[PDB]
Ligand binder design. Structure first.
Ligand SMILES: C=C1[C@H](O)CC(=C/C=C2\CCC[C@]3(C)[C@@H]([C@@H](C)CC)CC[C@@H]23)C[C@H]1O
Lengths: 241, 11
């Protein structure tokens, strides 16, 4: 059985996600507009989408049970290293295998491979990112599993610069155990086959995506004319030490 | 330094 504490963890994470993820994508109107006619025409829009998403990921992270017991230093390290991975994870909710795109409610806000190419990223990132999105979709995760996976992603003790690794691991383990118990109690066969193992493999995939994104971000942001198109928060999270 | 992240993370 799920203990009362594990039920509590799931309830909090579900609510946390509901309060930081608007499935009507209403705030997207406030971004610099998408331009699809190179020039890097989709950079301003997608920089804004990333920057917005970092803010939401932070607001989610703050609500993870136990995250509050960490020092601000370790909070910072964990969010800086995980932000791009959690954006990739949370984006799965908009991703559709119908046409391999992220569909955020209208044609203006529907992003395919070519749109992502127009923000300065190459297929070395984009092809594995799409493959990641497909594999994750095909897991058909319950919202409960999805929010737990994002929370486990964030509280990872192996991130460079973590000072109190044991406390981070303890926090993570509580979430991992909740996830494993949830799958056993609430996810019916056959969907549940090796489900936990497959979810953890996604976290490994995310490390490789993170590293490639970092390489490409370093390249993109080296030119002051592209850096100019980013946001202050993106420059701080992706660029600072 | 991460003043924006620290701000957003604040209680
Ligand atoms: C609110 C959401 C929506 O699901 C849409 C969304 C999509 C994510 C995408 C599609 C565009 C290109 C993105 C931002 C990638 C970067 C590498 C390109 C700027 C990573 C995740 C991708 C983010 C998520 O935070």
């Amino acid at each position: 059985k799920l203990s009362e504490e594990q039920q509590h963890i799931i309830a909090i994470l579900l609510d946390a996600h509901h309060k930081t993820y608007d499935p009507t994508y209403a705030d997207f109107r406030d971004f610099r507009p998408p331009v699809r006619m190179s020039p890097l025409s989709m950079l301003p829009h997608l920089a804004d989408l990333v920057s917005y998403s970092i803010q939401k990921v932070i607001g989610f992270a703050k609500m993870i049970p136990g995250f509050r017991d960490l020092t601000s230093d370790d909070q910072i390290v964990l969010l800086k290293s995980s932000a791009i991975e959690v954006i990739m994870l949370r984006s799965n909710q908009s991703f559709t295998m119908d046409d391999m795109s992220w569909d955020c409610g209208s044609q203006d806000y529907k992003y395919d491979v070519t749109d992502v190419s127009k923000a300065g990223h190459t297929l070395e990132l984009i092809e594995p990112l799409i493959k990641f999105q497909v594999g994750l979709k095909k897991l058909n995760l319950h919202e409960e599993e999805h929010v737990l996976l994002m929370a486990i992603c964030i509280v990872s003790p192996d991130r460079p610069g973590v000072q109190d690794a044991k406390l981070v691991e303890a926090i993570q383990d509580r979430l991992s155990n909740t996830l494993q118990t949830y799958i056993r109690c609430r996810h019916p066969p056959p969907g549940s086959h090796q489900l936990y193992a497959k979810m953890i493999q996604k976290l490994a995939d995310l490390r490789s995506l993170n590293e490639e994104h970092s390489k490409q971000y370093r390249s993109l942001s080296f030119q002051p004319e592209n850096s100019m198109k980013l946001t202050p928060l993106v420059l701080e999270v992706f660029g600072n030490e | 330094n991460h003043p924006m992240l620290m701000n957003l993370l604040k209680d």
